[model samples]
Target: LDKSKVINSALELLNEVGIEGLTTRKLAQKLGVEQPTLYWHVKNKRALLDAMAIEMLDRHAESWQDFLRNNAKSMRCALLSHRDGAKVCLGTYETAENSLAFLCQQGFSLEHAMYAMQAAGIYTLGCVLLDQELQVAMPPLVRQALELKDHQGAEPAFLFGLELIICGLEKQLKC
Candidate 1:
């Protein structure tokens, strides 16, 4: 089977059964192939996950700030697209080369570019994970401070945090 096809099927299965339930045996069954066939393509579950994470990236940009904003939004959307997608991307560093280059082109030093990407990625992943697993009670004051009564969706909080990161990077760039 084609490698991309395998990754796409894995993503579909990920949405259905989530990260915990996804397995080579089940994936082979889903793809109408033997376990060995999948092994030939993916080698192991970790490799499959890395490939899936790479597949999630759809990159674009304008200005540096706009680039970061769009990049964060795209990442959040991609992670939210699959079950436990944040978990899949967490600790995976294989997809950074292009983004690193992009940031350097935008005038960031390589070290700063790496930091910017890591910060944005970690923040996005944390937000997605929190949104997925969060179910908690809060004190009235705490809830009020968060504007919980307004039922503002996760996107606004995500965007707010992303802006904070972007603004911080902007300051760093000027300094």
Candidate 2:
């Protein structure tokens, strides 16, 4: 059987049950292959998870990072693309070259930008997790305002206030 199909099935399992919930037998059932067939593709479940992490990161490489930076609302929306994709991407996988290159192309200073890109990834992951914890995630504006209210002693009197706070943090040189 094609490894892609196997890996895809593994990822599906990963999303449905999370990393811990995945098992060879479950994957086999999902793929209609014997558990041994997966072993043929990957030495073991850990290996499969490792490959899955890289595959997930590769998908992020094709899409996120720069896409968000280059286009309005794109980055925010990209983080929300998959069911737990961003969370998985951030939780596992080192930052690969393509993602780093995307950051550099977006005008981040090599050192600071690298950190920021990863931080953004991490922050996005944090938001996903927090959403799970809170059982809620409003639009960015509302989340921003609520978070700002916590940060600045009170939320903005209006959306403009929220914009000013986010704008201040985000735009250093841009007035």
- Among these predicted structures, which one has the highest TM-score? 1
TM-score, cand. 1: 0.82
- Model 1 score (lDDT): 0.82
Give the per-residue lDDT of model 2 (tens digit) for 112-147: 555555454444455545544343348788997788
Error of 2 at 126 (Å): 1.0
Model 1, 1-175: lDDT tens digits are 7898999999999988888899999899999998998887887999899888878764211677887787778888887777787888884644567778878887899999988878887898899887776631177788875786357868888888898898899899986
Candidate 1, residue 136: how far the Cα is off, in Å: 12
Residue pairs in collision within model 1: none
C-alpha lDDT of all candidate models, in order: 0.82, 0.57
Candidate 1 residue 6 C-alpha distance from true site, Å:
2.2
Q: Against the correct fold, how does model 2 do in TM-score?
A: 0.55
Clash list (residue pairs), candidate 2: 68-75, 149-155
- RMSD (CA, angstroms), candidate 2: 7.8
Against the true structure, what is each candidate's TM-score? 0.82, 0.55
